[PDB]
Write a protein that binds this ligand. Structure first.
Ligand SMILES: [Ca+2]
Ligand SMILES: [Ca+2]
Lengths: 261, 262, 253, 262
């Protein structure tokens, strides 16, 4: 039918509905004026000029300017052939455009991938309040740690996060536990001291240290103090996930750590 | 520079605005959740799930089974290349789709173009817009030329239809071709050229003539060349069937022909 | 009041409605959570987090990430000044960008003004059918002509479009009329014959020429029912002018 | 490239797609009617009138003497220039409008910020996103600093707050400023120099340090500098009021402070 001709033109040769209808009409009727097209095909009267003019510019028609414009269809074997050839040239050009878009993006995104160290998630600073949230944060750090754990403990930490601490030790995590000497005998029946003696974790003590902390693989979790927080009672703590901050707290742990035993 | 990365992704790798922004963000941050994407980029919050999900689909993002779904970028060199490879295969399918369509159209139109009847010949003047569309008419002139052919070509009139020019030559049609010197390079070696060397047509060249044309038996096709209209593919070209007018253009051709060299 | 504060923030400091309301709220209350904001101001509850976070990235707020997200206003005198300083610098870069865009446009559009082929955007080819339309197009040209008129007339043009021909002559237009001897005596009581002798126009005749035409300053109107073609182009017209000058030679009196 | 001309007009001279296209068309063809514009350009037929009329309003098009159906372009050199002149003045108009608005807001807020408590300040930790927003906090630190200032600045932390730094020095604040070497060209105006030259503060420079900071008495503001988070203006910065943390950063500052010369 003629319907199939309209579809094919619309689908593959970039004509809109009216343009496809008008071109088919031109093939069938030869010379048409916009007025005649109106009566010949299914194209709105105010569009018949607009449409035929488009087909002209698209290479599907030729014309005779005048008070009344006459239009002539370009033979299908020419315009359909020409289109595919012109189409193929656009394609080939675009391919090059994409590979140059490719290279330019690679150049532009090298700055985003060059820093091969700090690839943490967005959330790197997290403020923790209260006892419940505190132990929940400490649990996670212990759950996620895979390389090392450094703990300076004046808590309220070894008890009862013991079962999380030992679990990490059981996973081969290089554990070091430093705690206040005054709090030492609290662990006299702990699992930690057994692992300390067997021993897969090292444990030491110190009369009192000023800056307690938990370090877990490029993460540090420490508490602010000012100055009756303990047993009065309220907690304010800060979590940071960044090698550079951890390096500071790790250097300090190692200063506290070398107070052997 | 970020804006450029978004532009390039959007125009050439078929990402929309938010998809392009999100992909850059994934590359930059290494890993994002829909919540984190909302936080760092200009993708609206409720849109961030679908954006990351579509990037995954398109091959720009990578994730784990879930539901603990975090999204991470696939390295650009392994995506932009893969996109192009996919695009090329999509093209090849459309190309043949067009070939199939063309042939069905020609078969459907066969009853319309045969015994059409075609109603032209009585029309002795037509206008063709777009200098690049000239071969939609000059092809027909060469098909029906049976006495003589005079061609003064800038590259846009009738050269490139060599098979039709030569068929005319081979059926005894007298042919004179005048080229601009800028066509002497692109028209090597060639097929049209060796006909001139064999003496089957005459071929000469001239620095520049201001009025290109194709004359085919009491018919003339000529271009009103203008480089300001060239930008809008809207140069006026005219076909006239009138030996008196053709005579005018034929005299002028012969004037250029005198200046024309070897 | 705060209604005025919200208005000003939206109009000049590029906050949306909810953001302006939320910042004002922060100034008033110091520390707020998204939940607290919801109860304090007219910001939709589910929008309160997004808004506060937006203010965070926009420099209007500071925060404490947590289960309890706290937000703190940046002092008005700092963020409002900070905005204007940054705004003013963004502008100047754009200023430079506009002057660089201008320069590139002038270079790109040079081919559009350099290719000095001074024609109109109007079409240059016009097909005319029928006599009434023919005489109107002919009338038009004669009135449009400003330099010269060349007419080879075996019509039915000079008769009777005379008043348009002489009107052109009266305007100082260089008129030359060639007409067929066979219809020549029709003009023996015309104004054209008077103007030919006075003479403000040159007039000759010839019993037969093959290509009649009207030329009016790089415009030509000639005939192929009857179908006529008008062309507006220097190079094409030159051919028709060359032919006119061949027919032009010569005749009395 | 026509497309480039449309882009530039569209991006910088506030023309929409159809207006920008039409202007190029006017430039190319010299004079157009709405009908003529529709035919040559990609502006839809029914739109060519309002498009041309609006170009006239904007100063890009001119009506012709006589019957005004035809439009002619106003030459680019007299429009693109005139636009910039108008735009600059329009900008300036808004600049003063913003400053005025600022001034009104501050007086409106005076009951909240004048003789302020403030309700915040008891809080000993805050986070600032965007390294370029850091001076919204560090300014406050410099204002209240009365013991010492230790500044290791990559350019975005506090060095661009000269008025407050100088004021601090003038009240006896021990001030050490450490800059990256790429800031020395631009900071030779200046206040910090001559104060470094007069011996009122110490100024050293260093190729690069990994942890920018501002220490003011018992407070530290430090940046987790990270490109390409900067690309999305989302670098995480932290303010802590706690002499123990400050001490760590103070040790590290003194580490950066060594070797750095000039
Ligand atoms: Ca402030
Ligand atoms: Ca202040």
């Amino acid at each position: 039918s003629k319907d199939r001709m309209v579809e094919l033109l619309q689908e593959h040769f970039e004509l809109n509905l009216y343009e496809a209808r008008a071109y088919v009409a031109l093939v069938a009727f030869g010379v048409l004026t916009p007025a005649e097209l109106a009566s010949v095909s299914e194209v709105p009267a105010p569009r018949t000029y607009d449409v035929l003019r488009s087909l002209e510019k698209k290479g599907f028609a030729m014309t005779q300017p005048g008070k009344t414009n006459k239009y002539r269809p370009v033979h299908p074997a020419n315009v359909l052939e020409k289109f595919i050839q012109d189409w193929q040239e656009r394609v080939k050009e675009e391919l090059e455009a994409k590979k140059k878009a490719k290279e330019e993006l690679l150049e532009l995104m090298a700055p985003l991938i060059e820093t091969e160290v700090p690839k943490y998630g967005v959330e790197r600073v997290w403020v923790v309040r209260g006892i419940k949230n505190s132990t929940l944060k400490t649990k996670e750090m212990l759950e996620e740690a895979q390389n090392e754990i450094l703990l300076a403990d004046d808590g309220f930490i070894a008890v009862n996060l013991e079962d999380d601490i030992i679990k990490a030790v059981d996973r081969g995590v290089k554990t070091k536990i430093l705690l206040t000497k005054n709090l030492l005998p609290r662990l006299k029946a702990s699992k930690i001291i057994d692992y300390a003696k067997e021993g897969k974790l090292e444990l030491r003590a110190l009369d009192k240290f000023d800056l307690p902390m938990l370090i877990c693989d490029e993460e540090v979790f420490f508490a602010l103090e000012d100055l009756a927080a303990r047993y009065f009672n309220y907690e304010t703590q800060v979590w940071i996930k960044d090698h550079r901050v951890v390096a500071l707290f790790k250097e300090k742990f190692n200063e506290y750590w070398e107070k052997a035993e």
